[PDB]
Design a binder for this molecule. Sequence first.
Ligand SMILES: [Zn+2]
Length: 357
Amino acid sequence: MGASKLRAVLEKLKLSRDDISTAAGMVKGVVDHLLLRLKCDSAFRGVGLLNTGSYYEHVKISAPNEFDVMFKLEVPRIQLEEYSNTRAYYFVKFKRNPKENPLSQFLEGEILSASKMLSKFRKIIKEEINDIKDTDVIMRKRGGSPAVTLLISEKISVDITLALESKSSWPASTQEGLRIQNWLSAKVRKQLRLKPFYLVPKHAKGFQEETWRLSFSHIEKEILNNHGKSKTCCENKEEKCCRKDCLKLMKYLLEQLKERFKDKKHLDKFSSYHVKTAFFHVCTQNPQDSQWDRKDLGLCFDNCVTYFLQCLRTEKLENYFIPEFNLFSSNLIDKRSKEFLTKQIEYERNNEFPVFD
Ligand SMILES: [Zn+2]
């Protein structure tokens, strides 16, 4: 009866998924143009999409016209140098000479200037969009990633993020992360940690302008699309779990609250990544597929709220790959804000989530 409201929500959220094809078509066309234009440039010759065939992703479950795209570009024989003790932010250096290095034009002494590479990236896409019909660049103010935001027609918006790709083994700060062993298995954790990692240009703590931040959204996607202890989770009537549903609700709950109190400015610092990160932690605490039965959707969603609430109240939310990086440290989000969102979430669940209606 109470899980009934939740399924109602999900059905209406699912509604904005049939006509993706008409908008996703316009996104694919614009990013193919931009890729080909950037490949025509020496510094960006190896540029490419993250998952070809998965052009876009939807960060905002409630804004289906807002698309997220990642352009990756391989940097062979990269040498990272961790910035301060932040565990997630790195200066980028090169094992090889600038003659062997196409990013050579972007060096600032020994390090890869994120601001120089971003400037050129933006200029090319900017100059190129001027020769694409119904598209404009609204572009920034987010540390570097995303680099640009495009406005296709006057309706669809695409965030384009540059990312360096490295095929070397993941940095030491990730040694004790990705604690999937009891859930998806040690075999799988070992397979995933053989994949590339990415660095996206992001400022760090005034600010340090040339840092890069580790990014694992390709691993996040891989886990969500292959998410169960049973290899056949969600492949038949008898093994339908509510993991993905719960993450949607978590996401929708935060976006609605952010909308509900946009005039107040306490929830501006929270994002979908925070509830995705907490969601993965809950999967780790609850690794059996029987702890996510669809008939238990109400109870499962409640556990995600209760975990997240404890994260706010204790001010701990470890990045799921870099356990010593705390998304909720007082240096990143202040206590007043966490207490405000605590109060609202606590209100919402005590009244069967009126923000859902
Ligand atoms: Zn499943």
